[PDB]
Amino acid sequence: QVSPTRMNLLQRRGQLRLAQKGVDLLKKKRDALVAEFFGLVREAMEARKALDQA
């Protein structure tokens, strides 16, 4: 734990605020990786089909 004063209450509010921003930051990162995953999946099935024809 931490010995509670009025300083540590604001330090833990600051740590909570940083984690609440970090959750939304990593959700934006996951959205960019979803966009690139649906980018690559059609290229992978296209190359797979060309491999099938050859």
Added chain:
Amino acid sequence: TVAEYLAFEHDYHVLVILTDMTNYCEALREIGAAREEIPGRRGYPGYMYTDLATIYERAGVVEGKKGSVTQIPILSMPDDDRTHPIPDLTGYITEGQIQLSRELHRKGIYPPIDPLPSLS
């Protein structure tokens, strides 16, 4: 009193071990709460800085004489912090502390002195 006598009138090299000053501050909290007196932090009175100062600052060496007083107070930090008024005001009067760590003693290290929160 005996430390100042044996160091500054008979030229010894007195080392004082002041065991567990948290009991002294508990006794001051008792006698300050029985007098209806202005608290400081966590119920300890106003003059606790002055009384811990007039215990601690009766040490050192003097000019032109031979003796020396070396004080090692021992502190039982209540919730092992540096925010309780007893280790806090103790660290304010004194010159440096040596702080023990609960992590290193669980790891089995003796003396478990972490050097980051300690200084001289």
Added chain:
Amino acid sequence: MAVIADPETAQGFRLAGLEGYGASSAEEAQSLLETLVERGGYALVAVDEALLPDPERAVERLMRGRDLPVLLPIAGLKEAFQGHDVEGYMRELVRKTIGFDIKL
């Protein structure tokens, strides 16, 4: 570059130059795959579709060393005269990825 695909049609892959092995038994093919991931056969192993759906799990068990030997499900020839089911293969790849039956 090595293959474990067919008993005889792996000779066409040898005729491409790239080396390989064929056993038509699953465990000796996987054992030559084991000495092929110990003695790394130049970073590519192409494994038959309708003999091993997932070749990679036993190989990452018996070698947690890195994925320099790449493992692909390469198509069997006979099923290649049917139809690849490209759609269903990408369905199972996406469900192996995130679990969801979501369809791109």
